[PDB]
């Protein structure tokens, strides 16, 4: 296969030459002309209490008022953030859960973990109580992330080093995605629900399309595991959080990565990231117990959600972008405005 | 809440009942302890696809044992989710502080030798130990 390898190297050289003809600078090198956000002050406006273990994931409803969250006490809670009212409480199949999703119509929630099964629960039934609607089985390794496409399709990734697109009523896989040498940790749903980005413990991520079952590109440049990934709601970027003490932002049409966010006091990895509804406040959690509210266009400034005394697992903003929730190992959801 | 309306009282009462149920559930939860079995495990698995979660009791204390006897590779989210265990029975960035009880025939490591009900009794003792020091670390007494 000498000819094939040589032609692959020639294609790589062509790609690099095309890169050099267009790449000149970065966002954080030209966007400096925008007025820095400076010191921003955030404060708790509510404090959602009731979880009694480490909280691993939270997720907003689309109305921007209801919230689902999961904690390692094998429990899944739906909250009213306006009045601190608890709306629903679901006891799970087993403790070792890792991910949450909400249905953008409001009728369903789906969870998963080590037991190699993705569970799906119906909220709005005529019996006046929640019950398990489906259990998708067929993966062999632990399940990492899950995001509804609509009331009838879901997508998961697992320790199998594979991803799978599923149809809920049938109960059988309708698409499968292979090509990872290491365990996949998370993936992100696009705004239009037609493209996915999935990062894996091989210092790389991959772009997938549901209708094709074949990747378009792979992203590399980190040094260690990838625990966090999310989008920029324009649909043209996604931000990665690694265990090499760095966050990066990757672009799709640039054939590279856009931004790098790091500091020396971060001798640890990034537990989670998330975006601002307009695209000006990036949020990151750490093992240094802080939540840094990084800026995006300036790569230097920051704020803090000081008030957490343990590790910050998960943080997310609404669709109207007026509040922010953080769940942490301290077992408290904190609402910030 | 005299400012509220008629139905906010019903919503508040519902949230308070949910709180009550959560509290009772967590209170009954917080007692059971955890043993990560790896591998004298042959008699252990019988005296006390994927991985096996099992539940038993001993001496009025409720044990959960997790068997990963096929996991001989590097742990990505096994070892991150295994931070919450009180004893690793044996026959990185996470387990540099977890007591490793060891059977034959900071990270304190024991050794025991064994009709053979000791297989259980031994580890039971370790349980108490691996808890006691922790609580002393809370009271500044050690």
């Amino acid at each position, epitope marked *: 296969l000498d000819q094939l390898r040589q032609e692959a190297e020639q294609l790589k050289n062509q790609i690099r030459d095309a890169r050099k003809a267009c790449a000149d600078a970065t966002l954080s090198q030209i966007t400096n002309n925008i007025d820095p956000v400076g010191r921003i002050q955030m404060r708790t406006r509510r404090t959602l209490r009731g979880h009694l273990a480490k909280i691993y994931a939270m997720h907003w409803g689309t109305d921007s008022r209801l919230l689902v969250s999961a904690s390692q006490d094998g429990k899944l809670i739906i909250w009213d953030s306006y009045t601190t009212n608890k709306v629903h409480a679901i006891p799970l199949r087993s403790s070792w859960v890792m991910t949450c999703a909400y249905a953008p119509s409001g009728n369903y929630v789906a969870c998963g973990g080590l037991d190699n099964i993705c569970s799906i629960y119906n909220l709005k039934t005529r019996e006046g109580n929640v019950r398990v609607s489906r259990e998708l089985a067929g993966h062999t390794g632990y399940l990492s992330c899950c995001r509804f496409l609509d009331d009838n399709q879901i997508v998961t990734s697992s320790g199998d080093t594979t991803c799978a697109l599923w149809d809920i009523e049938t109960g059988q896989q309708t698409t499968t995605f292979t090509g990872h040498t290491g365990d996949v940790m998370s993936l992100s749903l696009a705004p239009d629900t037609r493209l996915f980005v999935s990062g894996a413990c091989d210092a790389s991520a991959k772009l997938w399309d549901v209708r094709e079952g074949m990747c378009r590109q792979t992203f590399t440049g980190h040094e260690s595991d990838i625990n966090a990934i999310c989008f920029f709601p324009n649909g043209n970027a996604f931000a990665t959080g690694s265990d090499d003490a760095t966050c990066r932002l990757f672009d799709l049409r640039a054939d590279q990565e856009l931004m790098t966010y790091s500091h020396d006091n971060i001798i640890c990895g990034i537990t989670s990231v998330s975006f601002s509804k307009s695209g000006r406040l990036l949020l990151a959690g750490y093992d240094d117990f802080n939540c840094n509210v990084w800026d995006a266009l300036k790569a230097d400034r920051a704020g803090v959600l000081a008030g957490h005394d343990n590790r910050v697992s998960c943080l997310g903003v609404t669709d109207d972008g007026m509040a922010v929730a953080t769940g942490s190992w301290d077992s408290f959801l904190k609402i910030w405005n | 809440g005299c400012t509220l309306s008629a139905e906010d009282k*019903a919503a508040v009462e519902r949230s308070k009942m949910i709180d009550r149920n959560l509290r009772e559930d967590g209170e009954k939860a917080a007692r059971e302890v955890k043993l990560l079995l790896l591998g004298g495990k042959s008699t252990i698995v019988k005296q006390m696809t994927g991985i096996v979660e099992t539940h038993f009791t001993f001496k009025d204390l409720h044990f959960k044992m997790f068997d990963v006897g096929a996991q001989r590779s590097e742990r990505k989210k096994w070892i991150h989710c295994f931070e919450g265990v009180t004893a690793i029975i044996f026959c990185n960035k996470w387990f540099t502080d977890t007591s490793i009880i060891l059977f034959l025939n900071t990270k304190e490591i024991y050794t025991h030798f064994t009709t053979d009900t000791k297989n259980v009794q031994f580890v039971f003792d370790a349980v108490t130990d691996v808890i006691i020091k922790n609580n002393l670390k809370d009271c500044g007494l050690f």
Partner: single-chain antibody
Amino acid sequence: VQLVESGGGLVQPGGSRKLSCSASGFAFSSFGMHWVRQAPEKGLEWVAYISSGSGTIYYADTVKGRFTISRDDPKNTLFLQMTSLRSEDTAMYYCVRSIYYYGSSPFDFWGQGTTLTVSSDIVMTQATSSVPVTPGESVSISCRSSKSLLHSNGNTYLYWFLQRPGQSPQLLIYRMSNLASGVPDRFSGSGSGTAFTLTISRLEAEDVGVYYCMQHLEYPLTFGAGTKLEL
């Protein structure tokens, strides 16, 4: 979903009596209940309320002290006690299922009622008594509120129900804007504070009976005179 009432009949003047209801097909514990009255020739009239949890119980200003309400979750049963019955108590009596969290539908399932024969407050005003209609013709009904039922959060606790001949009432609209499950689309209706109007589009069939508007903004729960249609 089934609720079955019982304990009805005829009683001589003076004494006391009992009513009961048995439920089947839903999680009885997560619901509160209402007892509701209807006169043999007149409109509806609320009786009493029991809450999910048993911590709250509400009665009416007209027979307070004479009645009481209770529930039993282990068996999924509802009970009503009444004493010292006078002539003004002869009526039909219904039980209603209700639930309150953020976004639920209350008053959405009515039982079938039983007979019982014996030998300040906000005012809702129904516009008229009867309106002649023809098939396929758009219809409109209106009632008036003596107070601004609307609230600083957006709620407005006015309800729209329908009663076909020989049947039980059926929820049509809750909080004066929201359609219920299992109802056609052709029903609608809106309004502004103190003035509300139900609209029916393309009257087809099985829409003959009496229409009612209720309020829930504070206890007691008051009804209007009613509005019947003929065809």
